[PDB]
């Protein structure tokens, strides 16, 4: 069965997962646990929490949702290759060959004028990559489009670009057939897998006992359909972090609103039912004629676009069971006040449309001056911003003894832009006034000099061979160590190259 757990905080879902793992365990020790996460840090945090509670965390796999779905496809349906022939990487190299042949056709005339300029095949490769990305996105989200394009028909009421995209894909479906690669892909596999699972009398062998999905707040609808089909045979546990207690998604039709009102969420351990809406009788008043609900809190209304579609798709599941793990947030601080406003789906902001409401301010909640839960800081430069953040973190650490450096997190829009200032400010700090830090999500290319140097070596054929460039190549320590050149010798080499007359060029042939 497919079970959906709702909780405002991730810690309660993690504790429920720990409880589920403690109650029932896999029969075979080699059988690895399955957890579905999209980010690596989430898997690291889950492993750390599980190892801290149970005392160890091993034999746990964290595959991506698409990889897990393809693995289930390979396991259930017969005669399926391990790796799909249709993927972002291979479709690029296939279209790179397919496009010049299709250039002659009228339908691709707009592409033809684009491919006339390039002479080193850069435009062809870039177009192939940009088309393979959109083909992958269509495989994921638009299977009916590709199913109609394969036959040769066009989708009614679509964009004009389809005119050049529909034949090409079809040619691809033919071209991969000529090479002998497997015909199967995700769009064809979806319906056959769903039918095979629906018509199965017993669970097919090789399936995992239980599957955990956690940390994922957005899933494609077809993946949700496949998970609903798979839940009947193997147990699936979805841990969804829901910021609002009540149902804040939109509705499709009033008939959908009725069966939505019928649905209720049971308590985790108290065995008490709870309605989805705060007021069942006045639930229809909230929704608009088009079907878009008006969210009570303005912040959740503005920033809740992503979770709204996900909760609406989760509510559509017929055979899914739902539970509530929500924890109340006492409004003892400003941040707690905002979180409680988000949780209880209420708007405390006063509009002031009335004269009495505009005249007085007693309607608002009283704020404490010493309270510093939410603070805003204005700086002049990123250097000053980090220099102020360091002192603020030191003050926060001095204020609270239980606070530790690991508990603090600092997020920046562009990590690469602020990494130099972060390093400089945190390193310039003395011994006593020191704070250990660690930087993540930085680009790998800028990590080591060797990576940058090699990239330059790849550009040897199209080079003018300036003397300063060749000397900067020697400035690298590993390269100088390879040719047994020291720094004292590097000085003599610099002087001799300066006074000898070497300006540019390696030989007359260059």
């Amino acid at each position: 069965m497919l079970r959906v757990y709702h909780s405002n905080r991730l810690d309660v879902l993690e504790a429920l997962m720990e409880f589920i793992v403690e109650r029932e365990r896999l029969d075979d020790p080699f059988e690895p646990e399955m957890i579905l996460v999209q980010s690596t840090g989430m898997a690291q945090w889950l492993q750390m929490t599980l190892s801290q509670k149970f005392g160890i965390a091993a034999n746990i796999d964290f595959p991506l949702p698409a990889s897990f779905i393809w693995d289930m496809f390979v396991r259930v349906l017969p005669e399926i290759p391990k790796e799909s022939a249709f993927n972002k990487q291979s479709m690029s190299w296939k279209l790179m060959t397919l496009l010049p042949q299709l250039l002659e056709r009228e339908d691709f005339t707009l592409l033809r004028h684009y491919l006339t300029d390039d002479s080193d095949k850069r435009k062809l490769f870039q177009l192939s990559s940009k088309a393979a990305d959109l083909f992958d996105q269509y495989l994921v989200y638009r299977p009916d489009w590709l199913a109609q394009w394969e036959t040769g028909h066009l989708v009614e009421g679509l964009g004009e670009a389809q005119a050049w995209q529909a034949p090409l894909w079809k040619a691809l479906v033919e071209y991969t057939h000529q090479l002998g690669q497997p015909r199967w892909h995700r769009a064809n596999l979806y319906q056959r897998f769903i039918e095979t699972l629906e018509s199965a009398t017993t669970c097919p062998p090789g399936l995992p006992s239980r599957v955990f999905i956690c940390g994922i707040s957005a899933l494609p609808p077809v993946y949700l359909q496949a998970l609903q089909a798979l839940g009947k045979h193997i147990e699936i546990h979805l841990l969804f972090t829901n910021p609002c207690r009540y149902y804040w998604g939109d509705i499709k039709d009033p008939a959908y609103l009725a069966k939505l009102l019928t649905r209720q969420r049971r308590h985790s351990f108290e065995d008490r039912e709870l309605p989805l809406f705060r007021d069942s009788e006045n639930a229809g008043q909230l929704f608009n004629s088009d079907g878009e609900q008006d969210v009570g809190n303005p912040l959740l209304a503005s920033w809740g676009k992503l979770g709204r579609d996900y909760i609406y798709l989760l509510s559509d599941l017929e055979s899914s069971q739902e539970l509530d793990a929500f924890v109340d947030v006492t409004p003892d601080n400003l941040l707690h006040n905002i979180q409680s406003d988000i949780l209880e789906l209420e708007n405390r902001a006063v509009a002031g449309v009335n004269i009495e409401e505009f005249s007085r301010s007693d309607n608002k909640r009283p704020l404490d001056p010493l309270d510093s839960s939410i603070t805003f800081h204005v700086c002049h430069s990123p250097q000053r911003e980090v220099e102020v953040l360091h002192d603020r973190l030191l003050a926060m650490l001095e204020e609270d003894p239980t606070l530790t450096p690991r508990d603090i997190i600092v997020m920046v829009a562009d990590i690469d832009s602020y990494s130099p200032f972060i390093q400089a400010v945190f390193g310039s700090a003395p011994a006593d006034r020191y704070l250990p830090y660690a930087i993540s999500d930085r680009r790998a290319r800028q990590s080591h000099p060797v990576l940058e140097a090699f990239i330059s070596l790849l550009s040897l054929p199209d080079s003018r061979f300036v003397s300063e460039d060749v000397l900067a190549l020697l400035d690298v320590p590993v390269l100088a160590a390879r040719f047994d050149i020291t720094e004292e010798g590097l000085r003599y080499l610099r002087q001799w190259v300066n006074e000898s007359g070497i300006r540019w060029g390696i030989d007359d042939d260059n």
Binding site: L394, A395, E398, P401, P405, D432, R433, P436
Partner: protein
């Protein structure tokens, strides 16, 4: 007016850390473990294989 900077009565501790056997034993590796999580760090210091 007189100007005096604040002092830190408590010093933050770097005792808590997540480590591996290679980082605990082999100091020379440096950040080699960060670049490749599954790099064979047991063997280092290549020799002449001309």
């Amino acid at each position: 007016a007189e100007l005096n900077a604040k002092t830190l009565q408590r010093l933050p501790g770097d005792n808590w850390r997540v480590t591996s056997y290679s980082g605990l034993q082999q100091r020379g590796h440096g950040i080699a473990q960060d670049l490749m999580p599954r790099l064979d760090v047991d063997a280092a210091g290549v020799a002449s294989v001309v």
